[PDB]
Amino acid sequence: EAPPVTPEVLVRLADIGTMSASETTPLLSLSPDGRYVAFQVRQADPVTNLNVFRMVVKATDGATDAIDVDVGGEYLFWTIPSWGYARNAPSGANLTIQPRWSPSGTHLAYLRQDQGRVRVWRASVKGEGASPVIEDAYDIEDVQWLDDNTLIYSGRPGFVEAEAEIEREGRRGWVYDERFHPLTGARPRVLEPISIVYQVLDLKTGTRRAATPTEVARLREKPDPLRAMVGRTTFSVSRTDPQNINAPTTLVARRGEGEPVRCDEEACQNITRMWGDETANVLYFLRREGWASNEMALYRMPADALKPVRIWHATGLLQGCERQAKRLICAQESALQPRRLVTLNLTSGQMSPLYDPNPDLSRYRLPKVERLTLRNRNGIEVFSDLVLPPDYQLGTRLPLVIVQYSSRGFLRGGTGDENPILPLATAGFAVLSFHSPRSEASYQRFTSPIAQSKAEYSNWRNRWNILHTLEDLIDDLDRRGVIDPARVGLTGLSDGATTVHFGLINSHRFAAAVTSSCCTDSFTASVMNGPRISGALKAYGIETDQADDGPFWAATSFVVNASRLDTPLLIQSADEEYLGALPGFTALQQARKPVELIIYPNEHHVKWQPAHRLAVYNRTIDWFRFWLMDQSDPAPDKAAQYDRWRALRALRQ
Structure with a gap:
C-alpha cells in the first residue's frame, strides 16, 4: 500500500516564494512582536491551469492553525533590468512576495497582480478582509508602511512613457538596432536609464503625494545580511584580497574604536548570513560547508570572543530566516521535504516543524x-x-x-x-x-x-x-x-x-x-x-x-x-x-x-x-x-x- 509520487502529485506540491529561493530570499515576515509569521503559499492546479496564491499568517508558538488572510492573484513575474534593457522579457520565475506588517501588527501590505497590473493590497491578519489599496499606471514594485495609515510605494512610470514613445516611433518604422531582442518579440525594448519614483498614499484621505528624500532613503536602503552589531562590536566579513571575487571571506570584529580583528577558525569563512543578538551576548551565522559545500550549518558565537561553535547542520537549504528571541523562523527544504516553515532553537540545535503546506510526504511510497x-x-x-x-x-x-x-x-x-x-x-x-x-x-x-x-x-x-x-x-x-x-x-x-x-x-x-x-x-x-x-x-x-x-x-x-x-x-x-x-x-x-x-x-x-x-x-x-x-x-x-x-x-x- 501507500500511494506513489506521480506527476499529478508532484505538480501539485505547494511552495513558498520564488522557485530558486536561497538563504537571503525574503519569503517570510515576522510581525513586529514576533508572535506571527506571514508568507505566501502557491499551489498549482493542472486542470484549471492556474496557480492559487494565498497569503498566510501562522502564530510562531504553533498553538493556532494558520489563517488565509487573502486568496487569489495571478502569477507575478519576477523582473529585473539586465542588458541595459529596462525590463527584460520575464525569465518565468514568480516574484517572492514579502508581506509587510503594519506597526500595529494589524494589517499586511503586499504586492498582488490582477488583470495584468500589480497593485498593493491590505489584509486583516485575522478579521478577514481583501481589498486592493494602491493602483497606478505602472506596476507597484515595492511598498512599506510609514505608519498605520500611510504607505510609500515605488514604480517606474517613465517605463510606461517610453513604451508610448516606441509606439509613436513605429508610425515611421523602427531602426533595427541595440533596442531589439528578436527571440522574444518584434518591438524595440525600453533602454536604461529609467528612473524609480516614490509616492505615498494616505489611507484616510486617498491622497497621493511625493515621498520626501528621507522617506525614499528608508525604502531604498536594504538590510545587510553580512553585517551585524552586538553592543559596540560591529561584525562584518572581508577578504585579505578584496578584489579577488573568488577569495574566501572571513568574519571580522570591529571592537569599538579599535582595529578590525579577523577570526581564525575555519568555521568563520564564507558566511552567507549573520544575526546579532544583544540579549544573549551572541552572534549567529549561517554558511555552507562540508564536501563540495553540500550542507547548511548554523553557528553560535559568544560575542566577546571569536570562537564559533556549530549548533545545527544538515543537507538542504534554509531560506529567509528571521530571529524571534532565542528562535530562528525559517523556510526549510530537503531532498524528500518540500519547502516548509520551521523553527531552529538558537541554543540547542533543535529544528522543529512550524508550517507544512503539503502532507507529510512520508505517507507516500518514497x-x-x-x-x-x-x-x-x-x-x-x-x-x-x-x-x-x-x-x-x-x-x-x-x-x-x-x-x-x-x-x-x-x-x-x-x-x-x-x-x-x-x-x-x-x-x-x-x-x-x-x-x-x-x-x-x-x-x-x-x-x-x-x-x-x-x-x-x-x-x-x-x-x-x-x-x-x-x-x-x-x-x-x-x-x-x-x-x-x-x-x-x-x-x-x-x-x-x-x-x-x-x-x-x-x-x-x-x-x-x-x-x-x-x-x-x-x-x-x-x-x-x-x-x-x-x-x-x-x-x-x-x-x-x-x-x-x-x-x-x-x-x-x-x-x-x-x-x-x-x-x-x-x-x-x-x-x-x-x-x-x-x-x-x-x-x-x-x-x-x-x-x-x-x-x-x-x-x-x-x-x-x-x-x-x-x-x-x-x-x-x-x-x-x-x-x-x-x-x-x-x-x-x-x-x-x-x-x-x-x-x-x-x-x-
Missing part, C-alpha cells in the same frame, strides 16, 4: 535517496544525489536519467522544475540529481565574473570538466551494479541545456536526451539575441563573432554536427524560445536523426502554467520509457505520439 561524493580529475569536490525506485533490489541494473539542479533542497524538477525527479524514480528509473561542481577558473584570481566566464569558456574547459564529472558519476554507479551504462538519459534547462548539447556532441555516454531550449550555436547566441546582447556576450567567452563551423561552435552546434548526432533528442520549448531551435532542428530532420520539437504557448525560459508543466513531466517520462526501457503506455490519447516516435526509431536503419 524513492530511496543516497548522496554521492567524489573528487573529479581536476581535484574538485563533487556531490550529487542518487534516487532509486521505491521497491528497488540491488542486483537489478536500471536505466538512468540525469536531472540537473543549480540550487539545493527538495527533489522536485531540477533547475526549471522541468524534469520530474521523484515521478521518474516511481516509473523505475535510477535518477541522478546532478550538482555541477566549481570550475577550475573559480579557484584562480579574477577581479570580474565576466573575465572568469571567459576563461571557463576557453576551449570549453569548464564544459569538459562538467562532462568528465558526469562520466565519473555514471562510472561510479556502474561499478555498483546499479545502472545499465547503455541506457543513460540526460536532461537540462538553462546551463543544464548547454551541457546537454555539449554532452551529446562530445561523448557517446547518452542514449536519449531532453532539453527545454535549443541550440548552443551562433544562430541562437548572435542572430536571435540581437546586436546588443550579441556584442556583449563576447566578453564572457561566447564567440558570437565566429562562424558556426569554427572550432568554438563546432563543439555544440547541431547544424554542424547533425549527421553524427545519434542520441534521440526531445525539445520541450517555450514559444518565446523556439525560434532559436529551428535551424538545428531542421538540420537534424534533414539528416534523419530522431528529433521532436514541442512548442508551449505564452511561456518563458522557465515555464509557469501548471498544465504545461504537467504535460512536460509526462512527455519526458514517456520519452525515456520509450527509448531507455523500450516501453510504451497503451493509453489511446497517446497513440499518435507513439506512432511518431516509432517512425523516428525506424530512421535508424
Whole structure:
C-alpha cells in the first residue's frame, strides 16, 4: 500500500516564494512582536491551469492553525533590468512576495497582480478582509508602511512613457538596432536609464503625494545580511584580497574604536548570513560547508570572543530566516521535504516543524535517496544525489536519467522544475540529481565574473570538466551494479541545456536526451539575441563573432554536427524560445536523426502554467520509457505520439 509520487502529485506540491529561493530570499515576515509569521503559499492546479496564491499568517508558538488572510492573484513575474534593457522579457520565475506588517501588527501590505497590473493590497491578519489599496499606471514594485495609515510605494512610470514613445516611433518604422531582442518579440525594448519614483498614499484621505528624500532613503536602503552589531562590536566579513571575487571571506570584529580583528577558525569563512543578538551576548551565522559545500550549518558565537561553535547542520537549504528571541523562523527544504516553515532553537540545535503546506510526504511510497561524493580529475569536490525506485533490489541494473539542479533542497524538477525527479524514480528509473561542481577558473584570481566566464569558456574547459564529472558519476554507479551504462538519459534547462548539447556532441555516454531550449550555436547566441546582447556576450567567452563551423561552435552546434548526432533528442520549448531551435532542428530532420520539437504557448525560459508543466513531466517520462526501457503506455490519447516516435526509431536503419 501507500500511494506513489506521480506527476499529478508532484505538480501539485505547494511552495513558498520564488522557485530558486536561497538563504537571503525574503519569503517570510515576522510581525513586529514576533508572535506571527506571514508568507505566501502557491499551489498549482493542472486542470484549471492556474496557480492559487494565498497569503498566510501562522502564530510562531504553533498553538493556532494558520489563517488565509487573502486568496487569489495571478502569477507575478519576477523582473529585473539586465542588458541595459529596462525590463527584460520575464525569465518565468514568480516574484517572492514579502508581506509587510503594519506597526500595529494589524494589517499586511503586499504586492498582488490582477488583470495584468500589480497593485498593493491590505489584509486583516485575522478579521478577514481583501481589498486592493494602491493602483497606478505602472506596476507597484515595492511598498512599506510609514505608519498605520500611510504607505510609500515605488514604480517606474517613465517605463510606461517610453513604451508610448516606441509606439509613436513605429508610425515611421523602427531602426533595427541595440533596442531589439528578436527571440522574444518584434518591438524595440525600453533602454536604461529609467528612473524609480516614490509616492505615498494616505489611507484616510486617498491622497497621493511625493515621498520626501528621507522617506525614499528608508525604502531604498536594504538590510545587510553580512553585517551585524552586538553592543559596540560591529561584525562584518572581508577578504585579505578584496578584489579577488573568488577569495574566501572571513568574519571580522570591529571592537569599538579599535582595529578590525579577523577570526581564525575555519568555521568563520564564507558566511552567507549573520544575526546579532544583544540579549544573549551572541552572534549567529549561517554558511555552507562540508564536501563540495553540500550542507547548511548554523553557528553560535559568544560575542566577546571569536570562537564559533556549530549548533545545527544538515543537507538542504534554509531560506529567509528571521530571529524571534532565542528562535530562528525559517523556510526549510530537503531532498524528500518540500519547502516548509520551521523553527531552529538558537541554543540547542533543535529544528522543529512550524508550517507544512503539503502532507507529510512520508505517507507516500518514497524513492530511496543516497548522496554521492567524489573528487573529479581536476581535484574538485563533487556531490550529487542518487534516487532509486521505491521497491528497488540491488542486483537489478536500471536505466538512468540525469536531472540537473543549480540550487539545493527538495527533489522536485531540477533547475526549471522541468524534469520530474521523484515521478521518474516511481516509473523505475535510477535518477541522478546532478550538482555541477566549481570550475577550475573559480579557484584562480579574477577581479570580474565576466573575465572568469571567459576563461571557463576557453576551449570549453569548464564544459569538459562538467562532462568528465558526469562520466565519473555514471562510472561510479556502474561499478555498483546499479545502472545499465547503455541506457543513460540526460536532461537540462538553462546551463543544464548547454551541457546537454555539449554532452551529446562530445561523448557517446547518452542514449536519449531532453532539453527545454535549443541550440548552443551562433544562430541562437548572435542572430536571435540581437546586436546588443550579441556584442556583449563576447566578453564572457561566447564567440558570437565566429562562424558556426569554427572550432568554438563546432563543439555544440547541431547544424554542424547533425549527421553524427545519434542520441534521440526531445525539445520541450517555450514559444518565446523556439525560434532559436529551428535551424538545428531542421538540420537534424534533414539528416534523419530522431528529433521532436514541442512548442508551449505564452511561456518563458522557465515555464509557469501548471498544465504545461504537467504535460512536460509526462512527455519526458514517456520519452525515456520509450527509448531507455523500450516501453510504451497503451493509453489511446497517446497513440499518435507513439506512432511518431516509432517512425523516428525506424530512421535508424
